[PDB]
């Protein structure tokens, strides 16, 4: 079964990367969201 | 203001974290069998391009479980822009190169 | 000689506190542990 479609890309891998390109992006926003939040549990690490 | 800020600050000690793992193998050397044999699972799913999967680390002595990030990249030097792609300088000085060489060919 | 004897009794009497104090080392070693997996804020006074 045909998997050469990725060099036969009119574009080049360019239309793969930028695929690619939004999954770093999301993931990394969130994790910056999930960072500061997660901040939080440093509460109970320090006692009364 | 702050103080609980900066009580806050004073976090005790940390574990490693976001480690890296690369490689390369020729076209369906076994590579993606290797690599899902490391996390247990039977066999992982063969495609084209980078591929991403685990390493689920677990220390009893810190009781700790860890996921370490594994970049397994396919053949074809079609795809050499995805290691553009695939290491940033941040990630560079926690990567683990591994290889593959079938005795095969 | 009596400096020489003395230093022997007195090590002597270590040879048997040794092993209580291994196994101190071991139950400590279980305590702390436990504490790191009971992630407590151990002191800056904390010897490690």
Request: hydrophobic share 40%.
């Given at each position: 079964?045909?998997?050469?479609?990725?060099?036969?890309?009119?574009?080049?891998?360019?239309?793969?990367?930028?695929?690619?390109?939004?999954?770093?992006?999301?993931?990394?926003?969130?994790?910056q969201y999930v960072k500061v939040w997660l901040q939080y549990q440093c509460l109970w690490d320090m006692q009364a | 203001s702050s103080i609980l800020s900066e009580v806050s600050t004073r976090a005790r000690s940390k574990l490693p974290s976001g480690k890296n793992i690369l490689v390369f193998g020729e076209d369906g050397s076994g590579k993606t069998t290797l690599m899902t044999k490391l996390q247990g699972a039977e066999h992982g799913k063969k495609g084209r391009g980078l591929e991403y999967l685990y390493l689920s680390v677990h220390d009893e002595d810190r009781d700790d479980h860890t996921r370490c990030n594994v970049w397994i990249l396919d053949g074809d030097l079609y795809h050499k822009g995805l290691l553009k792609f695939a290491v940033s300088a941040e990630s560079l000085p926690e990567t683990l190169v591994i290889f593959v060489a079938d005795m095969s060919r | 000689t009596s400096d020489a004897v003395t230093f022997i009794t007195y090590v002597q009497s270590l040879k048997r506190k040794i092993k209580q104090f291994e196994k101190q080392v071991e139950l400590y070693r279980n305590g702390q542990r436990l504490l790191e997996k009971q992630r407590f804020q151990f002191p800056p006074s904390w010897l490690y």
């Open positions: 079964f045909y998997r050469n479609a990725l060099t036969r890309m009119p574009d080049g891998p360019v239309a793969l990367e930028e695929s690619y390109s939004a999954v770093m992006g999301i993931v990394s926003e969130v994790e | - | -």
